[PDB]
Design a binder for this molecule. Sequence first.
Ligand SMILES: CCCCCCCCCCCCC/C=C/[C@H](O)[C@H](N)CO
Ligand SMILES: CCCCCCCCCCCCC/C=C/[C@H](O)[C@H](N)CO
Lengths: 121, 65, 285, 285, 235, 235, 238, 238
Amino acid sequence: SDRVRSITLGNSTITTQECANVVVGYGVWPSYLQDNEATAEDQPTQPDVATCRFYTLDSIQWQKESDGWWWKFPEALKNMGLFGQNMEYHYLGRSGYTIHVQCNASKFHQGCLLVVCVPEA
Amino acid sequence: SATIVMPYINSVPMDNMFRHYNFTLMIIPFAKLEYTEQASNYVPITVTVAPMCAEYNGLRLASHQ
Amino acid sequence: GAQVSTQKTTIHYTNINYYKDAASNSANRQDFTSDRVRSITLGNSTITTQECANVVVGYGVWPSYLQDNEATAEDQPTQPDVATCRFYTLDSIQWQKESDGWWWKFPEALKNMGLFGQNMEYHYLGRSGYTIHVQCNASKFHQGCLLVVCVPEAEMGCSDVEREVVAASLSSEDTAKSFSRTESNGQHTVQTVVYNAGMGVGVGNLTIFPHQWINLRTNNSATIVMPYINSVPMDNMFRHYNFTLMIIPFAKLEYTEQASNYVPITVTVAPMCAEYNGLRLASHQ
Amino acid sequence: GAQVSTQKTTIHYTNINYYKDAASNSANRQDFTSDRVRSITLGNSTITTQECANVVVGYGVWPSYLQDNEATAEDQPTQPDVATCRFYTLDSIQWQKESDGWWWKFPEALKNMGLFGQNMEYHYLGRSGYTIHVQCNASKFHQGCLLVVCVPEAEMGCSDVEREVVAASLSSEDTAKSFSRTESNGQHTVQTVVYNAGMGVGVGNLTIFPHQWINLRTNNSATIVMPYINSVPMDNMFRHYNFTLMIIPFAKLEYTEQASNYVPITVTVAPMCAEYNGLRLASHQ
Amino acid sequence: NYHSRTESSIENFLCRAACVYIATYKSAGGTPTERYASWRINTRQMVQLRRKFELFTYLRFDMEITFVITSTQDPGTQLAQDMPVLTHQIMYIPPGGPVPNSATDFAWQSSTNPSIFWTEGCAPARMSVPFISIGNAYSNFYDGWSHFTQEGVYGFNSLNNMGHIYVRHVNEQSLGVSTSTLRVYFKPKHVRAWVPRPPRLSPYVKSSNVNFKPTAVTTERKDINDVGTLRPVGY
Amino acid sequence: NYHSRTESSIENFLCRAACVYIATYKSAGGTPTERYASWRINTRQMVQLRRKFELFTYLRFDMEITFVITSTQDPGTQLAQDMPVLTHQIMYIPPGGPVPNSATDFAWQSSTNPSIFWTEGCAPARMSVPFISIGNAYSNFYDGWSHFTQEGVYGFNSLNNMGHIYVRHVNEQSLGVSTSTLRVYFKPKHVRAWVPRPPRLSPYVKSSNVNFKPTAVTTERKDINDVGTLRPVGY
Amino acid sequence: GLPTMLTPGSNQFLTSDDFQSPSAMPQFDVTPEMKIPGEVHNLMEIAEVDSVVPVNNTKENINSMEAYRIPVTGGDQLHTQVFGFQMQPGLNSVFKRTLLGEILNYYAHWSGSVKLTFVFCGSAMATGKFLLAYSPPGASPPQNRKQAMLGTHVIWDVGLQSSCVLCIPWISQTHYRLVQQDEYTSAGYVTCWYQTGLIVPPGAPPSCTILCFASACNDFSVRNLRDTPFIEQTQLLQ
Amino acid sequence: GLPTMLTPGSNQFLTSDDFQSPSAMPQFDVTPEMKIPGEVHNLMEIAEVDSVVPVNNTKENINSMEAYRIPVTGGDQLHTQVFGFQMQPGLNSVFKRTLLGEILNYYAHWSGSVKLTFVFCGSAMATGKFLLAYSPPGASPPQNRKQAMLGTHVIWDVGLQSSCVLCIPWISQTHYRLVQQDEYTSAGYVTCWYQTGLIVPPGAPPSCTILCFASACNDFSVRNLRDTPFIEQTQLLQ
Ligand SMILES: CCCCCCCCCCCCC/C=C/[C@H](O)[C@H](N)CO
Ligand SMILES: CCCCCCCCCCCCC/C=C/[C@H](O)[C@H](N)CO
């Protein structure tokens, strides 16, 4: 009925909002590591479809006296898809992330939330 | 909902993912959720991450575990 | 319309197509006339073959990618160029005097080695060309011969009639199945006689398939660059074997009393331009 | 004569017509490639729908007149543009929890309203397009859904086999016939089960006919601008029903304890460009 | 995206000859209704063609009618011993024409009617008929009565006025008795189809209206989230 | 060197019609499986064509199917005395279609199926079929299982999904009983052949896999240096 | 005269032919052409119109209307699977009497991308997120959300938008898959899992009903024609 | 209409014909073309690939693998004949199940030059010379080396090169010789004799094994087509 943007990455989409802002990291978009700043010896292939899907983790349950929750994402996707089947073999690794956290709302369910991706916590 | 497009932040350009955590999500409710008597009480929260432009180097026939 | 041509003996023939289908015309039936050695470095593991040795390039063609001109997939995730291209070495089979022969089944013989068994365990489709290199260390007093051949679609008959075959007996995990110089008596195993090569054909007639000889006089090793041969462009590697190696010694090895008697044979395959499609969060086993 | 063309795979076909009739040729089988709301003011009665709401324009076409290019009548008396174009409002059906569905038959459902039942009672022929607008007043705590559909030529089967139907049971005068969620046991009535929609088809497959949804979350009303669909250009309106509305709730309405329980549904049709022919001094009833 | 539709067209879905009627007529004296075989032209007799037509409300096509007339020998005594070939006559009757009461009637001359004589052992007889109706389209559904006072028949059985095909033998057969069966086939071409409509879920029970018994929507599976079988049917 | 090859081409080696099946079906009441005759479309039944196909791994061709349908008279009593010509009906069934249980069934209309009616005493019936498969080539050898967990059938019997040809009589035959035999012939044209492979030395034993008994390589001669005969067989 | 030779194929009655024939009504003019609206050209235009699919096709429910309404109860579940079905458009009970299936059942082979649009019929104040994932044939059906996340998926916010649509992609070994799909040429499972849990306020009813609409995307094709194994008859009905 | 006359040849079913026929699947598009490698054009390209010939085809040996290995014992012989066979590519036991023979057995007439390449599988240090001579039909088979020397021959030094090849020449009264060769249209005997005697040093095994590869030269042709008298059946195998 209404217009909503749909990020299609890999083969799994989402539907966020038309009016919602999307925070692009520390200003920069996630990009590859070019030959200008590489220190490796040989560079085997990186997949563009096999590890780009919107993997969904377990659903935490919000109650009244719920304190908070955290994750550690390079060691939180080790079982999902091939992202835990490429890094289990190769020595090095580099990936940017596109976290999308959602909770189904209603007009009589007041409350707030803060998400934050602290680096090197 | 909320969507953060985090970039790869590290000093070294490449490091192993099993002995290093690149960052950490923290979902902390600053204001507690207060419903009413005739309202739903099982509000869930999911996280739906997706690695963008994942690169790998140094193939070793290891199969870690 | 109103065509004129020639026939195989002026004399001509005027045939018209009276139908609106391309498969309703007649058959065509007419023609319109210290030392230098090369070192293959693929992935991060080299070999050393010979300067003088020929390398058989498959059925004429070099192994290449599957372009967008002949793709039927929906979305195409990445293919690695370093992670799965190394010269993986399999187990070393041991050549004796009365050794019959050995075979392999390569889409289900690399499932444990490297990431080639860690990409095809997840993705649905698969496509890879192979660069087999089989070697045995020679000496001047160790006469004997060898034949290698990469037969494609080597359907093998069962030992007992009106039976099927079992996957435990058709292929092995790390070992090469022997080729009994006699006849197997099994109820579910493979008919593994050596003078019929499993498929029932004459074992002298295995020379159509790309083949090379490892004659101990004038050759130390053999390298076959087999291309991906299949009707469908993409098929799963766990329920389909693309081809089959067959190492059958035509002349037995005859050493002398004061000579070595533990001559080994290794195979050192390497998948070239391995492509994958259909990532499903499966982790097969 | 002497035509050449292409076939679906140079290759061609030369077929000639040997007969003097257009229906004797072969089949062709070849292709040659406070807020703003809109207000419909029709006649002298307006509506207010929404700014954001879509309006389904029939089978693509807007309702228009019958020009002289496709008329088969003898003499053509006048058609009114103000007298029969008003948004006539029918009776208000009442939506409850276990309400099955409702239907109408519109050429014999406007016979009492205005002059539309005072022009077609005299003239022999008739032609009119319709501009149905069905509305129900919404609220944010009144979940439920609705489907409207203007099925054309909705031949309805009788309740008992080897019987016909009766005009008293097929249509009603001012009321909408219910759609029993079970099966009618009548000897002459209509087979009015709700999971077969009367015609015997699957009730999920009523979405070909111009349809709109009155989902209480994101829609307050629905407007279908149906065009005049008939084989013959002109036919009498008393022995022919042009189409049939069907309001079937797919999701039942579920309110709460302290909420309103008398949610109504009205239909507010309006004939567009109504033409008449064959004035006979009859005064039918 | 280079997988365009050719065999999904309105022609190739409807340019296939379906069997419409099965007649049976003998060739002996006595019971004169057994000598000939009449048929009012419906498409509603056989189901295999009826469901293809009842996807669209209106239609307009030219047709190709064909007949595979085969015959047997009836049991009993006084059989032929030897028998020449026996020819059949297929006569169309327009709406409002005189019909024959029996065989060897006065009205079997067919001066205006398009009769066709067919010999056994040949190709099946074939003819083309154009779009023949008073209306502009062959309406498959007529939600309306016959009379203006809302009585008479109801349904599609008011604009199906296409007359009858009356078939007979044209040999006397002095010795024996032998039946024959007529199988009419309709292959509509130049087809145009207006106002599509859903397929009939319920089975057909009549050739006069849209009577039906209230059937289920689909078949039943196990649960809401039943995925069928996870492994094959063995073990 | 002016002895080039024309009859060694891939066309003329494979553009010859070989017999593929031998059916037999009666025309009497009782035992309804004897009235019709079904056949799943293989090429692996007859050997004379099978060895020509199993020189190449993959193939791609258009075909010309022909049938020499001949019939006899069954012994016993109540024979015909006299008998008109009897016509046969050959119906193709696609993979996933409804098959007839017996003769005079409801499903013998064949609205979508490409049936063909043939009369005796004429030329044999003929049709052309294109390259019809889901794959890109008719694979003669499929070294692989059906299921991804390596169970089910093994061999070429997983991509041979070509449906069946079901043949029947279309005369009632009130008096007598008479069988008929169907002989299907395949003549592939526009043939392309990929990846050649050796001929089968062992004899064929099955039409499901490549089962075989271990046979000798060639026949035996006398010695290593046997030149056969030095003079003729006389003296 | 002309010395022709009768080839094989003479005096036959192949049904799917295209031959000329003499006319039985010669010089018969027709009624002139009229523009009835809705002149369909190809049959696949009926398979581009959405038709509700009976997702809750349980044994008791199929007879009733409540076979089209899929339950989405509100509470803390986070494991319950709202629905799952093999995406076989021809044989599967879910899609066979739907419009896409009925045209498809006529044609033997199917190639294209199906689109399922799941509307939410619920109170305006309700808000929730659901993950609908097409898992390709691979190995075993998804049984927990973590298994479903790997396969292609869309997160739908019920509150932000009703009617989220998933265009199930065409990933297949062969160009065409038979409508009567076998283990070979089969299609992957499709499943939907709770992401946050429906949050319905006190004033609205907790339960809600979600319905499924299935129509082929533009790139859909059929390859053969066959009898429909859905309708039958016994005698000449009179 | 056109007054044709049906010539003799009407209503027949000649098998090796080329006639048109109406299509049973009209307007049926195909799967697009793919480039599978190894697209053979003519059948004789299989008869240009070498296939080992069972030269030691003795009764006990044929069942065993040891029918392809021809013995070349080392010692002073100078009279022993390593092998001899009539060069009949179709009937001869030696060449009939070889690839050249199997394609040839399908075709009735054979014309061309056969090539036999004899590889030596032996210790690197071994050295010897062998005279392989094609004696044309003439009179009687060669029985001593002096008899063989007159006929066309090649002296092969085993030590200098393994794999010496003899292209047996085409010398014949007729352009084509029937595969089932009779005394007329027959072919000459081929034989191999020791020239110097194999000299194998103390460290290597005295015995060695020589194998024979047979493939037609470029100028080979076939003339007719016939049933293969090698494969048969009894009933419709099921
Ligand atoms: C060759 C002799 C027989 C000629 C028969 C006359 C032509 C056949 C009548 C054409 C049938 C028209 C198609 C269907 C007409 C009606 O609309 C349908 N029955 C609707 O019920
Ligand atoms: C005219 C009515 C009958 C029409 C029959 C349909 C066409 C016949 C099927 C074509 C057969 C294709 C050639 C062989 C297919 C498989 O690859 C082989 N059987 C391999 O076993």
